[PDB]
């Protein structure tokens, strides 16, 4: 029925009438028509919006002064083989990753863009990649979603060679405005410590004032974007 109307929910039941709710309306049935020419990539709009993938590699290479030919990049299990393809384009010939779907893995493998791919689920076990192995790594989101555990992230940067570039994105809990500082503060210490420095930061449209976010209220089904939806680049071993 109606999602908006449904609240707590009611479980009424009376012996007298068998029908749970009145309204047989079985005399006639209304007919509905829908478009059969629906586009193939319009099945999922959200998937189309990168909000990091394409933006990352352009900027990463932009802030990458090293040799992307002899550099190694690490991509997740998101079928991100395309990014690996672009990576090669942007000079990033060597890209390694790990997939968790035989179907998706085969796709990326068959791509021939990844130097090596393996079956893993971030958090299951420590990363199979040695330290200082990959010059750079690119993985957006999934860090807090449940794909790549925050514990594993350092294993990604750790395995990343000095001067390398790591571009990660994650939910920044839009619910707590002030909380974001806690996240951003952690990065700042890491930069100050010399472990890594910012190389770029895909400007997010979530930066808009989230304290009020006054609107007409026509719908706003999706979150305004108090803090979530952030993809920012970084370089291994740097002070800020």
The full set of domain ranges for the chain reads: 45-236
Experimental method: NMR
Angle, CA 202 vertex, CA 228 and CA 48 arms, to 5°:
75
Cα–Cα distance measured from residue 197 to residue 165, given in angstroms and rounded to the nearest whole number: 9
**DSSP codes of every residue in the chain:** --TTT--S------SS-SSSSS----S--------S---STTS-HHHH--SSHHHHHHHHHHT--S-TTT-EEEE-SS-THHHHHHHHHTT--EEEEEES-HHHHHHHHHHT-EEEEEE--TTSS--SSPTT-EEEEEEES-TTTTSS-TTTHHHHHHHEEEEEEEEEEE---TT-TTHHHHHHHHHHHHHHTTSEE---EE--TT-S--S------S---S---SS--EEE--EES---
Q: Into which CATH architecture does domain 45-236 fall? A: 3-Layer(aba) Sandwich (3.40)
The CA-based dihedral angle spanning residues 116, 120, 123, 125, taken in that order and rounded to the nearest 10 degrees? -80
Cα atoms found within 13 Å of the Cα of residue 226, Cβ hemisphere only: 16
Residues 6+ apart with CB under 8 A from 228: 171, 172, 173, 174, 206
Distance separating alpha carbons of residues 179 and 16, to the nearest angstrom = 56
């Amino acid at each position: 029925g109606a999602m908006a109307q449904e609240e707590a929910g009611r479980l009424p039941q009376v012996l007298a009438r068998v029908g749970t709710s009145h309204g047989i309306t079985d005399l006639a049935c209304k007919l509905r028509f829908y478009d059969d020419w629906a586009p193939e990539y319009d099945q999922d709009v959200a998937a189309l919006k990168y909000r990091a993938p394409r933006l990352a590699v352009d900027c990463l290479s932009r802030a990458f002064r090293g040799s992307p030919h002899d550099a190694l990049i690490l991509d997740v299990a998101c079928g991100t083989g395309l990014v690996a393809v672009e990576l090669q384009a942007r000079g990033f010939l060597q890209v390694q990753g790990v997939d968790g779907s035989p179907e998706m893995l085969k796709q990326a493998r068959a791509r021939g863009l990844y130097h090596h791919l393996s079956l893993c689920t971030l958090g299951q076990e420590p990363l199979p990649d040695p330290e200082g192995t990959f010059d750079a790594v690119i993985i957006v989101g999934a860090l807090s979603e449940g794909q790549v555990p925050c514990s594993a992230i350092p294993e990604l940067l750790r395995v990343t060679k000095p001067g390398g570039l790591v571009c990660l994105t994650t939910r920044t809990n839009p619910s707590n405005l002030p909380y974001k500082e806690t996240l951003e503060a952690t990065l700042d210490s890491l930069e100050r410590a010399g472990v890594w420095e910012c190389l770029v930061t895909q400007p997010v449209d979530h930066w808009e004032l989230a304290t009020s976010e006054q609107e007409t209220g026509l719908g706003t089904c999706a979150n305004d974007g108090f803090i979530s939806g952030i993809i920012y680049l970084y370089r291994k071993q740097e002070t800020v």
